[PDB]
Amino acid sequence: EPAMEPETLEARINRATNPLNKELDWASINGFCEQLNEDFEGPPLATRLLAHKIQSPQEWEAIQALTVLETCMKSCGKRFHDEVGKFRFLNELIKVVSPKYLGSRTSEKVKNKILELLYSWTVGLPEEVKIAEAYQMLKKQGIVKS
């Protein structure tokens, strides 16, 4: 009586980023990355869902969401990489760290993790020209750790 119809990306991400989680839910996290490739609508939906979660005022929700993003960048391939490397997504991270937007009430832990991940991708995936541009802009505008 196990359900054949695929679990939704919404159901999956809500479990992977649930503020009640006592520790990282790796099964749900790995499951979400594994499933977002399953259709055309998948990877853009996944990035929209992640962007919302990352903007949470509840620190543990946002930190879990960033851990999903980190993990999916490792396990997933091109369609997901292409969605993350658009300003459609990158702008949502910018809004989290910028004082113009949400930055003044975002947790330092969340802001620092965003800067780490962006920096990591500049070195690990140098082809992604818009990730490089966004990161260069954040430095130019004086967005730094702590």
Partner: peptide
């Protein structure tokens, strides 16, 4: 032709 993206938001 046309971008499927949007302009970068400035921090």
């Amino acid at each position: 032709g046309f971008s499927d993206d949007v302009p970068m938001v400035i921090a």
